[model samples]
Target: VDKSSAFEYNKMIGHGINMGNALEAPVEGSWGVYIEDEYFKIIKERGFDSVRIPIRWSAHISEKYPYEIDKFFLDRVKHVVDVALKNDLVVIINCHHFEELYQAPDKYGPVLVEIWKQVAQAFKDYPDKLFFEIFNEPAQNLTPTKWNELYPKVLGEIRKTNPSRIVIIDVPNWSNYSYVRELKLVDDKNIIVSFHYYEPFNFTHQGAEWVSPTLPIGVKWEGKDWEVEQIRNHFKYVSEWAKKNNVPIFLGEFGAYSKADMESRVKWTKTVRRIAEEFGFSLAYWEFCAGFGLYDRWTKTWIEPLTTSALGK
Candidate 1:
C-alpha cells in the first residue's frame, strides 16, 4: 500500500507486452494462440520489462459457492507466471473476459469476490514482481458506478491474504481514456491506474470481424502534426490527473490490428509509445503474436520495421 511501491512497480512494468489471445480465450488455445515458456525468455532478452497476462478466469471457474477455479488451469497459470518470473521479467495477471460480471454485477458480484480469494490464496506467496490487476475493460451493464462499487470489495478480499501486494485497477468505460476521470479509488493501497489506447478505434479495430459493423480495412493514421498532437494531449490529460491523484499510470494495451496498412500502424505505434514515455507511464503493447502483434508466430521472428519501431531502433 506504500505510495512509492506503485511507481517502482510501474518502472518494472516498463516496455512490456501483452500475452493476449491465449489464456483470455474460452480455451487457452481456442483463439489460436498459446504461450510457450520460451516466449518469456525472448521477451526479457528483447529489452522488455514485463508481461501482462490476460486470463479469463470465469471460463475456468465454477458457478456455485466456493467458486473453485479448475486445478489444472490454476497450475497452468502458475507455470506461466513461474517461468516468466524466472526470466526476471515483471508479470501482471488480470481477470479478463469475465462476461457475466460485466453483464450483471449484482447477480454475479459475489462470485467475483470468491474468484479473487482463490487466486489470492493460490499466489499469496508470490514476489512483488507479480502484480494483480483487479479487472479489465469494465463496460456494458457494469457501469462505472458498479465498477467503482465492486472493485474495492474484490480488493478487500485480496488484501485479506495480500495486504501489501501491488494491484492494478482500470478506469471504467472499457478503460477508455476519455472516461478516466470517473475512476474512484478512495484509498491508494499500492494501486496503479491503467488505461488502454486505441484512440481511433476505427483504425485499430478495422477489419476485426468481432466488432459489430466491422470497420472497413482502408483506414490510415498518417502521423500528421494534429494527429500526433491529439494523442499527445490525450496522454497529457491522463498525466495531469495521475499527478493530482498520486497514482502511477500504465498504458496497459495499445496497437493497431493486422489489417491496418503497415506504415500507418508503425507510425501510430511509435508515436503512441513516444508519448507514453514522455508522460512517465509504463506500458505494454496490446499483444505479442496476434492480429496486432509485434512478432510473427509462424515466421518465428519479430515483424520487421514494426519491431524496430515498437522496441526502438
Candidate 2:
C-alpha cells in the first residue's frame, strides 16, 4: 500500500448527509434513519459527486478500554459505502459523535486510534474511492498543531496495510475559517484538508434548536454586500493556504437552518456555489434529510412547508 497516490479530490463538489446525529442508551444507535444504498442513489441523482457519512462508535461500543465498535455498526457503514461506490460517488467516513473522546485525548486516544487502525486495515484493499476523516469538528483547545501531530500517528498505524487511503483532516472550533490558515498537511500528499462553514452565525445557524440563544422565527439568510466580502475573504484565506501547501481544500460542511425563509436560503446557496467556484474548493452541504434537506420528503420536492419570516413575503 503506497498510501501516497490516492484519489484526486479537488474535482469533488458534493454534499454530506448525516447518516445519523447523536445517540443515547437503550439500543444505543445513531441518529437519523438507517441510511440505505437507495439514499446514496438519491444523493447522486440530486447532483452530488460525493457523500460524507458520520459514524458514532461509542453508541455501540462496550465500556471496556478496548471499546470495540460492534460488527453490526461496521456492517451498516459498509453497506452505505457500497451503495455510494456503486453509484460512482466518492465517500468519506469518520467518527461523528466521538467528540467526548476527542475532548479527552489522554484517556481516549488509544481506543480512538485503534478504531482507525481497524477501519483502515479492514478497507485496505478498497480503492482510493473510500476516504477516512480523522474526526469531525474536534473543538475547544484541540489545536491545529495537535491535530497535525495526531493525524500522522494514526495514519502510520492505519498504513500498516491500508497505506494509500485518502484521509480528510478537520480543524478545531467547529472547523472555523480562522483556524484553517494554521493547518499544515504533514507528510501525506494523499490527505485532504477540510473545514465547515457556518459564518455570520446569524444566517446559517438561525433557528438551530440545539444551539443556545435560538434564532427568532423570521430570521433568514438575506444577502448583503458585506457577505460577499466575507465569502471573498474566506476564499482568499483557503486559496492562499492551498496554493502554498499544494493540497486541495474541502468545505466538508455548509448549510442554512431550515427554519429560514426559502427565498433567502436559495440566495445563500447560490452565493455558496459562486464562492466555491471562484476559489476551486469542493463542498458538501451539512446534511441531506433533517436540518437542511433540499427536499421536503413528504412533499417530494424542494419546497418548504414550515412558516418562516422570509417565506410569507
Residue-level lDDT for 306 in candidate 2: 21
RMSD of 2: 4.6
Return the TM-score for candidate 1, rounded to 2 decimals: 0.97
lDDT of 1 by residue, 222-300 (tens): 9999999999989999999999998999999999999999999999999999999989999899899988898887878
Give one clash count per candidate, in the order shown.
Answer: 0, 3
Off by over 4 Å in 2: 1-7, 13-32, 302-313
| lDDT value for model 1 | 0.91
| Model 2 global lDDT (CA atoms, 0 to 1) | 0.68
Question: Candidate 2's residue-wise lDDT over 249-302, tens digit each?
Answer: 788877778787778777776676568667867777666666677545566554
Worst 10 residues of 2 by lDDT: 304-313
RMSD of each: 1.6, 4.6
Model 2, 163: alpha-carbon shift in Å? 1.4
Residue pairs that clash (backbone atoms under 3 angstroms), model 1: none
Instruction: Assess candidate 2 and give its TM-score to the true structure.
Output: 0.87
